[PDB]
Amino acid sequence: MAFLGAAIAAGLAAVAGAIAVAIIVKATIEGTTRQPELRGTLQTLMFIGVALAEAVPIIAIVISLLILF
Amino acid sequence: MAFLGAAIAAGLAAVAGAIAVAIIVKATIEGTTRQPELRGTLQTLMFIGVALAEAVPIIAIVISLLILF
Amino acid sequence: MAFLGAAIAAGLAAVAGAIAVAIIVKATIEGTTRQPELRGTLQTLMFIGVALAEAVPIIAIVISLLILF
Amino acid sequence: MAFLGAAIAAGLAAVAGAIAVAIIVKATIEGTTRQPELRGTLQTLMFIGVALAEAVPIIAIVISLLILF
Amino acid sequence: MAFLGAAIAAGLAAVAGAIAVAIIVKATIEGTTRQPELRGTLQTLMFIGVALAEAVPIIAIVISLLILF
Amino acid sequence: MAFLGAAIAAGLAAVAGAIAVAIIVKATIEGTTRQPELRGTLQTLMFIGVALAEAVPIIAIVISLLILF
Amino acid sequence: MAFLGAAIAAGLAAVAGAIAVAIIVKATIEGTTRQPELRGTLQTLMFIGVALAEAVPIIAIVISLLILF
Amino acid sequence: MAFLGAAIAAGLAAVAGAIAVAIIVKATIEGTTRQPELRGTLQTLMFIGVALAEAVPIIAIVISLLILF
Amino acid sequence: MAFLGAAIAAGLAAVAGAIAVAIIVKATIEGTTRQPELRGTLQTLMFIGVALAEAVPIIAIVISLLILF
Amino acid sequence: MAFLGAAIAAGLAAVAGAIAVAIIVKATIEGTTRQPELRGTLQTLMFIGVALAEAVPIIAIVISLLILF
Amino acid sequence: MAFLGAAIAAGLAAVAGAIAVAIIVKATIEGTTRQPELRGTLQTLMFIGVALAEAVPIIAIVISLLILF
Amino acid sequence: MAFLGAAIAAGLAAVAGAIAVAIIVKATIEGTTRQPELRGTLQTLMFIGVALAEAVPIIAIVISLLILF
Amino acid sequence: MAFLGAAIAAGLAAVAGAIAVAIIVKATIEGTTRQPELRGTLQTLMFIGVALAEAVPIIAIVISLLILF
């Protein structure tokens, strides 16, 4: 049952990565909305934000591949 | 369980991707409604944000194909 | 297992797409009500956003049909 | 197994579609309430909203019927 | 496995349909409370809303009956 | 498995009906508190709302009785 | 397998019935607090609301008894 | 199965009754805080609401205890 | 099986009673903070409320003992 | 089975007990923040509240030990 | 079962302990932010609160070890 | 089964530890934003809060290793 | 069981890590938006906060790999 091991690993990583970015991006959009001059700064905070937020889920994706292969 | 492993992966990736985009898009619509003059900036933040939020779910999808095969 | 792997894959994709569109459309309706003169740009944000929030759920349906067959 | 599969697909598609429409219609009723002049534009925005949101659930119903048959 | 199926499909259709109507009806009640003159207008949105929100749950029922009978 | 089915079907229809009525009645009570002169109007809207929300659960009940017998 | 069934049917009808009454009564208390003179009016709405809300859970309690005995 | 059943029917009836009373009592406490002169009215309304909210969970306890013995 | 039953019964009764009391106490504390002269009145409602909220969970505990022993 | 039962009974009692007083303490902290003169009164309600909220979860722990030992 | 039991007991104790502290600390941080003069008073309540919050989860951990050893 | 136990223990400890810190840190960031002069106290209050919130999750990780080894 | 073990340990660690970071990053973005001059201070809190929030999930990842290999 390595298939389920790759399913709920990549699946939970998908939910993790997507929602985390969605939260961060939304915060940037709302931030840019009321402070347009802070666009460049808030975009940088987003880019390093999603990078850290995707760290573990990517590792979970790697593990999901190691379970399959 | 190859079909189940391809169902959990693709299913959770669907929920991940769809909701994440919906969270991001809604933020832009609300932002554009507040600041129509930030239409171009917020839409750029959208496509960028959607691209990041779709990374892992798409990776979760190609895994669902590797499980099916 | 060939029917279960096509049920929770299509079921989750249904929940994914339907709710995602609902969130996006709701934002457009509320935006249009708040700012009627933005009816054009907000509706274009909808159709683009809905299309993006349907990418993976559509693939999840395609994968689901590949399970039954 | 086809009896259990067709149930989950149809069951979730029901949850998907019904809630999605409910969220959209809620926005239309609320929008029309605070802006009766925008009744027409919000109503057509509902129909195109329901149609897109009900798409995948309808497909999930077809798959459900394909599972059962 | 046919009794369980006919129950899940009908059980999830009940939850879907009842809540969907409740959300729509609540919006109609709130709107009528705010703008009593729009009672006939919002009541029409309710019936059109309920019917569309009841579509898939209704189909989920005939699928539940197809599994049972 | 017929006992388990009739249980879930009636149990989920119970959650469906009870909560749906609760949401509608709560809106009726709140609306009546806000605009008391609309007592009969909202109550009429409640009865129509309850009946429409009680539809599928009532159907899900006769399914439960059909599973038992 | 009838003990488990009669438990689920009665257990869910318990949660359904109790919470639904709580929501309706809470609205009655909040409304009575805001409008003390609408006590009897709202109390009548409560009794009618509770009766309709408890209708299906009571049926689920009967099915629970039928599953047992 | 009689043990496991009586657990669910009593455990869920516990969650049902306890939370429902909590919601009702909390509303009574908040209401009494706003309008101290409505102490007797709100308390009378509390007892009635609790009695109704506990009605079905009491039956669920009886049913569970009938499963045991 | 009597162990699993005693667990679910006592475990749910724990979650029921603890959260119920918490909600009631949280209300009494906020009520007392808001209106200090109603300290004795709200404390009585807390005790009466807790006794009613703990009624069923305690019975569920007794049942848990009846299943164990 | 006896181990699993001891887990559920103690695990749920942990979630019950911890969250219960967390709600109570948070209420006390907020109450003290607003009215620091009532710090003595509110702290009494906290301890009494915690004792009542931890009553059943502590019993659930006893059940867990009766199952284990 | 002993391993799966030691897991649930410790896992639920972790969820219980970590969240309950987070709730208390958040209240302390916000109270301190609101009233800097009460940083010492609220810190004591936090320490007392955490101790009461971790009590049962600690026992659940001890039990988890008793299941494991 | 030993791996499954080590999984649930480690997984739930991760969920517990991460989210708890997230709540505490978020409160500190919002506190620092509102009160820059209090960043010294709020950071200490964060570190103290984090250490307390990570107590049980760490032990749950230790147990996860004992189950595994 | 080693595949389900490594998956759950990695999957839940992903959900833990990603969401916890998302909450922390969002707080920093909103904080920077509210107070641009506190950018450097809040960026420090984010980096320290993320490192603490990712502590246990990373350990859970190590455990996940300590199940496979």
Ligand SMILES: CCCCCCCCCCCCO[C@@H]1O[C@H](CO)[C@@H](O[C@H]2O[C@H](CO)[C@@H](O)[C@H](O)[C@H]2O)[C@H](O)[C@H]1O
């Ligand atoms: C604190 C209050 C205590 C009240 C105690 C009330 C005692 C009188 C009520 C009847 C008790 C016995 O009720 C009975 O319980 C046991 C366990 O569930 C089961 O008993 C049944 O199975 C057991 C299995 O060994 C058989 O030995 C027994 O002949 C059979 O009747 C039945 O389910 C139920 O008929």
Ligand SMILES: CCCCCCCCCCCCOP(=O)([O-])OCC[N+](C)(C)C
């Ligand atoms: C196996 C089943 C897996 C299901 C996974 C579903 C994950 C869905 C996560 C969605 C989280 C969205 O939270 P958010 O965008 O902050 O706002 C939510 C709205 N409020 C702020 C009002 C709460």
Ligand SMILES: CCCCCCCCCCCCOP(=O)([O-])OCC[N+](C)(C)C
């Ligand atoms: C299994 C599937 C579960 C799906 C659950 C989906 C729940 C909803 C998802 C999140 C929807 C969006 O919320 P949000 O962006 O926080 O609100 C934004 C609104 N304001 C900006 C005004 C605050």
Ligand SMILES: CCCCCCCCCCCCOP(=O)([O-])OCC[N+](C)(C)C
């Ligand atoms: C079987 C699984 C079924 C899951 C169903 C989940 C449905 C979730 C619906 C969630 C609707 C939320 O609406 P929204 O647009 O976020 O507005 C919220 C705006 N405020 C935050 C300001 C309130």
Ligand SMILES: CCCCCCCCCCCCOP(=O)([O-])OCC[N+](C)(C)C
């Ligand atoms: C099977 C389980 C089904 C559960 C379904 C629960 C669905 C709950 C969805 C409704 C949650 C709230 O969102 P909403 O009222 O749309 O937003 C309100 C925002 N405005 C005020 C701006 C309109």
Ligand SMILES: CCCCCCCCCCCCOP(=O)([O-])OCC[N+](C)(C)C
């Ligand atoms: C398994 C069974 C699960 C059933 C769960 C049912 C949950 C239903 C929750 C529905 C609650 C939301 O209601 P609504 O109409 O959107 O109003 C919300 C309007 N405001 C947000 C503006 C206040």
Ligand SMILES: CCCCCCCCCCCCOP(=O)([O-])OCC[N+](C)(C)C
């Ligand atoms: C077995 C599972 C049972 C789950 C039951 C969950 C019930 C969820 C719905 C309960 C509340 C729905 O109230 P409503 O009328 O939408 O107004 C809500 C308006 N406010 C938000 C402002 C208060």
Ligand SMILES: CCCCCCCCCCCCOP(=O)([O-])OCC[N+](C)(C)C
């Ligand atoms: C398995 C079942 C476990 C029990 C679940 C019971 C859930 C009951 C929830 C009932 C919630 C109270 O509803 P309401 O005051 O109409 O809205 C209040 C909504 N806000 C809190 C956001 C204001």
Ligand SMILES: CCCCCCCCCCCCOP(=O)([O-])OCC[N+](C)(C)C
């Ligand atoms: C095993 C699962 C157990 C889950 C238990 C969940 C219990 C949730 C209880 C929620 C208590 C809510 O209180 P309420 O009366 O709606 O006040 C709301 C007051 N306002 C309307 C003004 C906001």
Ligand SMILES: CCCCCCCCCCCCOP(=O)([O-])OCC[N+](C)(C)C
């Ligand atoms: C199996 C594990 C189940 C765990 C379930 C935990 C449920 C926790 C529910 C917590 C409900 C909190 O409600 P409350 O603070 O009275 O209302 C808040 C509204 N006011 C701010 C106006 C007071």
Ligand SMILES: CCCCCCCCCCCCOP(=O)([O-])OCC[N+](C)(C)C
């Ligand atoms: C099996 C593991 C289950 C874990 C479940 C954990 C649930 C934690 C729930 C925490 C509830 C917090 O309540 P409270 O601080 O009174 O409300 C504060 C928030 N409102 C005022 C908006 C309502």
Ligand SMILES: CCCCCCCCCCCCOP(=O)([O-])OCC[N+](C)(C)C
């Ligand atoms: C696997 C199980 C995972 C369960 C995870 C549950 C996480 C729940 C977190 C709930 C955190 C809520 O914080 P709180 O201090 O109550 O709100 C305080 C906010 N105000 C002060 C503004 C009211």
Ligand SMILES: CCCCCCCCCCCCOP(=O)([O-])OCC[N+](C)(C)C
């Ligand atoms: C299966 C479990 C998946 C994980 C679910 C975890 C959900 C945690 C959500 C925590 C969100 C709450 O945040 P908080 O800090 O209370 O602030 C809220 C109060 N303010 C916004 C005013 C500051």
Ligand SMILES: CCCCCCCCCCCCOP(=O)([O-])OCC[N+](C)(C)C
């Ligand atoms: C296995 C199941 C996985 C489910 C994962 C669900 C994760 C949900 C995380 C999102 C919850 C917290 O979001 P947030 O942005 O702090 O909003 C807090 C609410 N305000 C907008 C009002 C501040």
